[PDB]
């Protein structure tokens, strides 16, 4: 149980066409919960919300250029 | 002001053979400690020390290819 989660709090402002990666780290022995880290255009890692249809919508804006 | 550190435990003991990739993260705003994670050959991540001169020991063994 050494290593821990890589997130703290959710982000309000979300820029659909300003992100690159989306590391979706599922629950593990380390972090008791899942993770949605995205990398920004400038290279700034942020965490997001799961519940809301964030990604459901964000995917398109990533896949369609 | 989110994004927590990945490491909580330093550790030094490890196999210089059974490993894949290693990275060092700079002391950022989100994470103040000097991060040193390494992806295991079996599918796990572990942390290391700064002043413990055993990180270099493994690096070299990977370039032997």
């Amino acid at each position, epitope marked *: 149980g050494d290593l*821990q989660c890589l*997130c*703290v*709090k*959710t982000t309000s402002q979300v820029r659909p066409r300003h992100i690159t990666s989306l590391e979706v780290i599922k*629950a593990g*022995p380390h972090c008791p*919960t899942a993770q949605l880290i995205a990398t920004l255009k400038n290279g700034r890692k942020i965490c997001l919300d799961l519940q*809301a249809p964030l990604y459901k919508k964000i995917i398109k804006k990533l896949l369609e250029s | 002001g989110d994004l927590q550190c990945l490491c909580v435990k330093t550790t030094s003991q490890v196999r210089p053979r059974h490993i894949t990739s290693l990275e060092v993260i700079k002391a950022g705003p989100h994470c103040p400690t000097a991060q040193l994670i390494a992806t295991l050959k079996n599918g796990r991540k572990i942390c290391l020390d700064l002043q413990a001169p055993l990180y270099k020991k493994i690096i070299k063994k990977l370039l032997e290819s």
Partner: antibody, heavy 119, light 108 residues
Framework: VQLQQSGAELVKPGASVKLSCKASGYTFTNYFIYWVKQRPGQGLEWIGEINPRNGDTDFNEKFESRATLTVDKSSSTAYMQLSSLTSEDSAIYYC?????????????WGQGTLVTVSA | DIQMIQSQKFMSTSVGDRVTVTCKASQNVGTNVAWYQQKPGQSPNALIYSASYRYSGVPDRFTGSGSGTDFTLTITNVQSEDLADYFCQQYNSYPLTFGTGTKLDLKR
């Protein structure tokens, strides 16, 4: 143990009781701390939250006066006194934690401390 | 203060039964729900969050359902170990609110 707690005891109505809570790791300074008492007859009630970095809280309005939180960066410590007891303060108190700072449920809890009112 | 209405509080079922912990919201919380497991005379253990997403190291038996004002917790196969208590949660507005509890008894 990561979230230890204080001993169980009773006190007189209209008094003050000081609790204790310790943690292990950086999983203190960033994460929001929470306090809850177990009746256990009726159910569970929320007292409030408290930021470890700043000091800003946000108590429950019904049980605001019967509450006082002071977080000390000494050794990951979190205390709670009680401003004047009654008789309904008979509930076991917890020092809980949450995984995404101040949201997404309550992961770690702790042993607890049983408090009653009679004298 | 919102409160979460738990219709059933005292239930009982056999070895391997589908149980449905009824929990309806007074006002809207929006999926921000949590289920817990209180062991007899022990601290409530983290069960599941957002009536779908399960925590680390939680058996497949536990399953959440519903969204908004209506939520449901279901369980496929039960064992002697799974005998305890189960609570209800909402986390969208401070102060955050709990419930009442729903105990169960195993038939043997």
């Amino acid at each position: 143990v990561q979230l230890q707690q204080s001993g169980a005891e009773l006190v007189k109505p209209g008094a003050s009781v000081k609790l204790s809570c310790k943690a292990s790791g950086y999983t203190f300074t960033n994460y929001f701390i929470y306090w809850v008492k177990q009746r256990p007859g009726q159910g569970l009630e929320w007292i409030g939250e408290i930021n470890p970095r700043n000091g800003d809280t946000d108590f429950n309005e019904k049980f605001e006066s019967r509450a006082t939180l002071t977080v000390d960066k000494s050794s990951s410590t979190a205390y709670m006194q009680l401003s004047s007891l009654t008789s309904e303060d008979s509930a076991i108190y917890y020092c809980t934690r949450s995984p995404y700072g101040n949201n997404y449920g309550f992961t770690y809890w702790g042993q607890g401390t049983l408090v009653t009112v009679s004298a | 203060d919102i409160q979460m209405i738990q219709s059933q509080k005292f239930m009982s079922t056999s070895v391997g039964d589908r149980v449905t912990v009824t929990c309806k919201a007074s006002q809207n919380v929006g999926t921000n729900v949590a289920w817990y497991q209180q062991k007899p005379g022990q601290s409530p253990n983290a069960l599941i969050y957002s009536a779908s997403y399960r925590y680390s190291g939680v058996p497949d038996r536990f399953t959440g359902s519903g969204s908004g004002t209506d939520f449901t917790l279901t369980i496929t196969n039960v064992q002697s170990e799974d005998l305890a208590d189960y609570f209800c949660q909402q986390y969208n507005s401070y102060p955050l609110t709990f419930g009442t509890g729903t105990k169960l008894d195993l038939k043997r």
